[PDB]
Design an enzyme around this catalytic site. Sequence first.
Site, short mmCIF file in Angstrom:
data_model
loop_
_atom_site.label_atom_id
_atom_site.label_comp_id
_atom_site.label_asym_id
_atom_site.label_seq_id
_atom_site.Cartn_x
_atom_site.Cartn_y
_atom_site.Cartn_z
N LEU A 37 0.86 -1.20 0.00
CA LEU A 37 0.00 0.00 0.00
C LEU A 37 0.90 1.25 0.00
O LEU A 37 2.08 1.13 0.17
CB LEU A 37 -0.87 0.01 1.27
CG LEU A 37 -1.86 -1.15 1.24
CD1 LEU A 37 -2.57 -1.30 2.60
CD2 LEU A 37 -2.83 -0.84 0.12
N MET A 318 -0.61 17.77 -8.90
CA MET A 318 -0.39 16.35 -8.60
C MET A 318 0.51 16.23 -7.39
O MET A 318 1.72 16.04 -7.54
CB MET A 318 0.28 15.66 -9.79
CG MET A 318 -0.72 15.40 -10.88
SD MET A 318 0.01 14.67 -12.37
CE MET A 318 -0.27 16.00 -13.21
N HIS A 444 11.31 33.65 19.71
CA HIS A 444 12.64 34.18 19.31
C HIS A 444 13.72 33.33 20.00
O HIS A 444 13.66 33.14 21.20
CB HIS A 444 12.80 35.65 19.77
CG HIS A 444 14.17 36.21 19.51
ND1 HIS A 444 14.45 36.96 18.38
CD2 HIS A 444 15.34 36.08 20.18
CE1 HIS A 444 15.74 37.27 18.38
NE2 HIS A 444 16.30 36.74 19.46
#
Lengths: 465, 465
Positions: A37, A318, A444
């Site tokens: 998969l 895509m 920061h």
Amino acid sequence: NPYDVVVIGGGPGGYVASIKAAQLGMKTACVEKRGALGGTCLNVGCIPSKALLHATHLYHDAHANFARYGLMGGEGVTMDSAKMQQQKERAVKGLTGGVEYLFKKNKVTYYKGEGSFETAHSIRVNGLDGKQEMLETKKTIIATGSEPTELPFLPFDEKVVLSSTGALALPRVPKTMVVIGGGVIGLELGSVWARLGAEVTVVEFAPRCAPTLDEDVTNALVGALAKNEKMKFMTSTKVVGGTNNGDSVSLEVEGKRETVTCEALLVSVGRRPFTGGLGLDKINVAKNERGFVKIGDHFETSIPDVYAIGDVVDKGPMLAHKAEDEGVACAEILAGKPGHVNYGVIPAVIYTMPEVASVGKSEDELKKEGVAYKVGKFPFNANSRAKAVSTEDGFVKVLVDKATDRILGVHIVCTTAGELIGEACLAMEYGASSEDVGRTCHAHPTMSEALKEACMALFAKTINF
Amino acid sequence: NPYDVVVIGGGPGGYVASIKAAQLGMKTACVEKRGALGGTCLNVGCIPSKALLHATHLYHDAHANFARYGLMGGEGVTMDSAKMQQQKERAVKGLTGGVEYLFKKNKVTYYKGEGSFETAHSIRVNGLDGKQEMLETKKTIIATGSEPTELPFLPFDEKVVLSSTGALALPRVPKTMVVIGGGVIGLELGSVWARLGAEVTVVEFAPRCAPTLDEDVTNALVGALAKNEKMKFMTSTKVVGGTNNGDSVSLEVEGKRETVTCEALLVSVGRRPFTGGLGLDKINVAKNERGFVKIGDHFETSIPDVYAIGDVVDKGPMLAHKAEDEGVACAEILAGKPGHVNYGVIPAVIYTMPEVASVGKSEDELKKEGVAYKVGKFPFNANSRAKAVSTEDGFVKVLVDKATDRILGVHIVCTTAGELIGEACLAMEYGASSEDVGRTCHAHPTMSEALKEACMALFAKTINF
Ligand SMILES: Cc1cc2nc3c(=O)[nH]c(=O)nc-3n(C[C@H](O)[C@H](O)[C@H](O)COP(=O)(O)OP(=O)(O)OC[C@H]3O[C@@H](n4cnc5c(N)ncnc54)[C@H](O)[C@@H]3O)c2cc1C
Ligand SMILES: Cc1cc2nc3c(=O)[nH]c(=O)nc-3n(C[C@H](O)[C@H](O)[C@H](O)COP(=O)(O)OP(=O)(O)OC[C@H]3O[C@@H](n4cnc5c(N)ncnc54)[C@H](O)[C@@H]3O)c2cc1C
């Protein structure tokens, strides 16, 4: 069986649509022919490319930058290409096996084989084990993806004429490599091998690489690639012929002709939608001239009860996250919920170093559309974190509507652009103005401060530049 | 002269307030006694610490992780501590010199010396060059910052009993080092030297380090520090005495007594507001019992026309970005504009590796306030990018109001937490719900997807876990 939903394709689009549909209560099956998969992205795309870009970036830093920080001996670091490929496979294996577990956890039925339409409601599965089966379903999602575009006169053999799949699997560093197509895939894959020693030349037909991006952005990137990876670029160059000599390739190009010789050729000119063997003609699902499946706002094809998502459809770029969001939205729509994707806010990232991340519109597009905009730009050579760790390349560029201060696009070039763009995406999803972002407290020292200050340059003035 | 605004202190608070006031049109002067701008943060705080954390992280990776990716020879990398310190100074110099240029560019008048109040509208400057001057002004901003808290029985000598300033400047790696105070500064500074070989022991009075953070977060961090830096932790331990022996320190602690011996002791128990030599008593500016200057919602002190911001005030955490945002807001208020700081959305980052970043409320606080909340948690061992590059430590935890889905706090532990928190900050500044973030498209593969999915675990279910 019968099923509520059958998904053909197990890539980012299909595996996510399968899990989401199952979670929403639908009896779901997913048909995938590859044997694993994850589709293109997990197996031969996103994952292996980012794994190799990471390992090679460490290698480059050891050789090029270690001494500046006080680290000695970086010159003695070498890359065992076999071990490097082995770690890449390990990473891919961990992710593809994980998806199978998610299918089990969510009760998605997984069929290994090629799916084909018999009728709009019956799907033939030609199992990998030879056995055939017929699935009956109420709804079908086509998520069959794409494949590499081949040059007709120089077919891929994945030995010397390579597609991205062959280039990701090279067992050793080629001496010379030519990349046709200076897009995201060519630049990432060319950087991997250039970092390890290959002489890489990029041949691009357009005036500049990544033509979709603004010139100041690509300029910052190509300048770095030319300096660090020593890549050579040939833009406004056409490939007119070539010969595969078995152990090398001879390419003929023209800007006036010329012949280039290389040990490995990467053809990354584009990808095309893939519907081979699907039987779309049998049921008359409409495709445009480029072969993309045509869909409407709810992912529906021209045939009732048949939907499509991901790389195969005629909408959006895509990209994996696009397919994933379409999978979620489509599953939601099939469950009677209001699903939708915001195509105006889909980011795109190039994982070279420095990285490039963009979301929203480019200047080229705003100019083309006649929008009056303001540009706020903050360079990383003025950013606290970038100066503290000495990785000052790039900048953040924010484009706002000159009339309403609304952010129209954000483009970032820097070592951590991929993770910074999420903040810009949320901003645009919300319709934020530059002032909204500029007045938010950013930690920061962080590179995200450059986004805060580029926004301040739009509605006011930046502080640190 | 006379001035519209005089700022005493050139740290993140003062130098930003100075630039912003000047940009808004006010005739501005900044008085700083150190000899360089940037205050604690640029000179002996934020910057040098992140510069050393970066160089030492590269060193640690070369020794600990290079082989996994296929890089050989990492064992041969050594750190030249002199060259390491030299790059750190180079980085600091580039930033402090940059601020002087911004002052020039913005027309801020810079006085080098110690400022003292004569009256609420006249400031005496005792120049570094011996010359005295009297400034007359309409408004004054006190931004005098803080200093390290000293242990009365073991005064700093910056040779063996060190404050963070002395620990950042060590010329060589100590063999053994004890760190008193397991807070952000102790953990970062202890990591720097532990990575280079020092045996570091952290002594913390509280039950756990960084007591301000939830236990699952600090647990993830301390487990990594114990494994990678090999740091030893002694929590619920009190320091009762000690002796500076000149070239070593003997510390007596108790949890039952015990004596610890070390070559270098870092005392990082806390920082105290600094108003030494300012003459606050002469003009009766009110301070609380801890010595912080008391201010109202508009940064005004008890004395008309005298304001205060940054580490010296009784509001918010002692962090640079807080001081910087207070500086901008205060400057805006003095120009007749509506300035304000959102104290409920100030992030905090720990630059160890993995990094820790938090914004908003912790679970411990929500429990204390009786808020009914839901927790969404996504581990990085299930995230696409983290698995692809094999840096799987940590997780993202999102806390939402169980009734309204509003995000109440976000806590991240991972290699790139510092840059990821900006997205969470914008979300909270906007009052976003977990669904708002969960439905935004995030690029794939990125660690920011773990924030998207942790949000999805709140209003629905995550997909990849
Ligand atoms: C080298 C490379 C790197 C990339 N890197 C990134 C990145 O970092 N980020 C990013 O966003 N995008 C990236 N992409 C693009 C990304 O892979 C795609 O956008 C993505 O896979 C969208 O896919 P999907 O689910 O629609 O397609 P899929 O992944 O392509 O479709 C895949 C599947 O459909 C199956 N299939 C097709 N027909 C049938 C059938 N009839 N029966 C059964 N199964 C069938 C195939 O076997 C395959 O598994 C990369 C691509 C490449 C080539
Ligand atoms: C080791 C260390 C690491 C840190 N890292 C970080 C980090 O990564 N991120 C973060 O957010 N915070 C960090 N901090 C905290 C950060 O430095 C503070 O929050 C910050 O400096 C807030 O400061 P400021 O402007 O109010 O104070 P300042 O920077 O401390 O005040 C500084 C100045 O006031 C001047 N001054 C005082 N009195 C007078 C006078 N009478 N006349 C003239 N001048 C005077 C001093 O000389 C000095 O320059 C760190 C601190 C330390 C010690």
